[PDB]
Design a protein around this ligand. Structure first.
Ligand SMILES: CCN(CCN)c1cc(C)c(OCC(=O)N[C@@H](Cc2ccccc2)[C@H](O)C(=O)N2CSC(C)(C)[C@H]2C(=O)N[C@H]2c3ccccc3C[C@H]2O)c(C)c1
Ligand SMILES: C[C@H](CCC(=O)NCCC[N+](C)(C)CCCS(=O)(=O)[O-])[C@H]1CC[C@H]2[C@@H]3[C@H](O)C[C@@H]4C[C@H](O)CC[C@]4(C)[C@H]3C[C@H](O)[C@]12C
Ligand SMILES: C[C@H](CCC(=O)NCCC[N+](C)(C)CCCS(=O)(=O)[O-])[C@H]1CC[C@H]2[C@@H]3[C@H](O)C[C@@H]4C[C@H](O)CC[C@]4(C)[C@H]3C[C@H](O)[C@]12C
Length: 327
């Protein structure tokens, strides 16, 4: 099993480095289990955002194969566009020829892009979620017998305490304590599982829960959120879907998610973000209201900071265990 060290940025997201090109051109990635394409900004990029970034130069790579098919990647937080290219992609010490998007326009991905220090996004989703039918990196690696299992694991960094690791091809007991519980996927192409969701007396039976490394909140159905916030002494920021609270607000609830197999809780300490700068003793909730057609929670970064997670393509399941507080 190889692994990629995960560095914290502002206790809100984390990044890992990988390389694209036969000359070791190094890039910082958001590692996103909710998307299925890899992209890097190109030397051909003519946007303000690209100015600050590590850029990909295919002319300097002898393993570069031209594709040139045009493509737009639309995310909830914005859009990037360019064209497909193929080159050798190196993750940890493993590599494979791989198809990815060479990005020439990032103006539709502002203000996210220029505000953060990542260069690109490396998707870790399922094939049918990809534009252009790209087999996921971990599936290809397994198929090429470079790893033991078509699986990867997230041991997330904890700001001012330890680094994290993305591990490819196998599970390591050092990352977690207690039992590891596998939850079957309820969807063909999302890392989504079925859990009963409880927050106080508010309950949602057999909710869709998407375990997602690229989202820096817990998302909650908007009706469920409105019920949670009733008489909670929290205040919404003008123009933005964020709520502010005293950090030691005694009413802040604990999320409890349950299956047949297990029980996962998320206490206020994991979903609060200190904002001492805005005022003393104030926190933002890392919780946003979001309605999917079917009632869904996204168990983002705040969930994965507490819980070590195993993404298993072969067994179409997500393993969940309490992350070790330190290595
Ligand atoms: C079915 C169509 N399709 C396939 C096209 N052939 C397709 C393709 C893609 C890439 C899809 O994912 C789009 C996407 O942006 N998916 C995101 C997850 C998501 C979030 C909210 C609602 C739905 C999904 C994706 O994983 C993700 O985390 N992304 C996309 S860019 C990013 C910065 C890495 C991050 C993101 O926006 N994060 C922000 C975010 C997002 C939600 C709430 C809070 C915050 C604060 C930030 O953390 C979806 C949902 C469908
Ligand atoms: C994904 C949800 C819901 C979006 C939605 O309600 N989608 C349907 C409406 C119709 N659309 C307008 C999208 C038209 C196209 C689809 S249509 O089917 O109509 O053709 C939207 C609503 C509010 C959005 C956040 C805030 O901004 C603040 C912040 C800004 C940064 O920059 C990026 C991060 C962040 C956290 C945002 C992320 C995300 O983005 C959110 C959660
Ligand atoms: C392209 C990116 C498109 C494709 C699928 C879209 C989402 C889904 O449609 C479900 C849902 C419908 C709501 O209306 C608004 C919120 C949400 C989560 C959509 C947001 C966004 O628009 C997505 C990610």
């Amino acid at each position: 099993n190889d692994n990629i060290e995960l560095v914290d940025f502002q206790n809100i997201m984390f990044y890992g480095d990988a390389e694209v090109g036969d000359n070791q051109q190094p890039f910082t990635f958001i590692l996103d289990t909710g998307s299925a394409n890899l992209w890097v900004p190109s030397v051909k990029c003519t946007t303000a955002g690209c100015l600050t970034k590590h850029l990909y130069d295919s002319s300097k790579s002898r393993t570069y194969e031209k594709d040139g098919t045009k493509v737009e990647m639309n995310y909830v937080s914005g859009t990037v566009s360019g064209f497909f290219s193929k080159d050798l992609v190196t993750v940890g010490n493993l590599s494979l020829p791989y198809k990815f998007i060479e990005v020439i326009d990032t103006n539709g991905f502002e203000p996210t892009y220029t505000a953060s220090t990542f260069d690109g996004i490396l998707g870790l989703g399922w094939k049918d979620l990809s534009i252009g039918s790209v087999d996921p990196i971990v599936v290809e690696l397994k198929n090429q017998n470079k790893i033991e299992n078509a699986l990867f694991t997230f041991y997330l960094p904890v700001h001012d305490k330890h680094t994290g690791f993305l591990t490819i091809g196998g599970i390591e007991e050092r990352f977690y304590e207690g039992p590891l519980t596998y939850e079957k996927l309820n969807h063909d192409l999302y890392w989504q599982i079925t859990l009963d969701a409880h927050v106080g007396n508010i309950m949602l039976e057999k909710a869709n829960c998407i375990v997602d490394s690229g989202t820096s909140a817990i998302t909650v159905p908007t009706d469920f959120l409105n019920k949670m916030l009733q008489n909670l002494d929290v205040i919404k920021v003008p123009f933005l879907p964020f709520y502010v609270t005293l950090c030691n607000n005694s009413k802040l609830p604990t999320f409890e998610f349950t299956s047949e197999n297990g029980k996962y809780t998320l206490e206020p300490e994991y979903y609060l973000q200190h904002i001492e700068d805005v005022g003393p003793g104030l926190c933002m909730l890392n919780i946003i209201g979001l309605d999917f057609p079917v009632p869904t929670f996204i168990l983002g970064d705040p969930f994965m900071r507490k819980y070590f997670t195993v993404f298993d393509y072969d067994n179409q399941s997500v393993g969940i265990a309490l992350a070790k507080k330190n290595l």
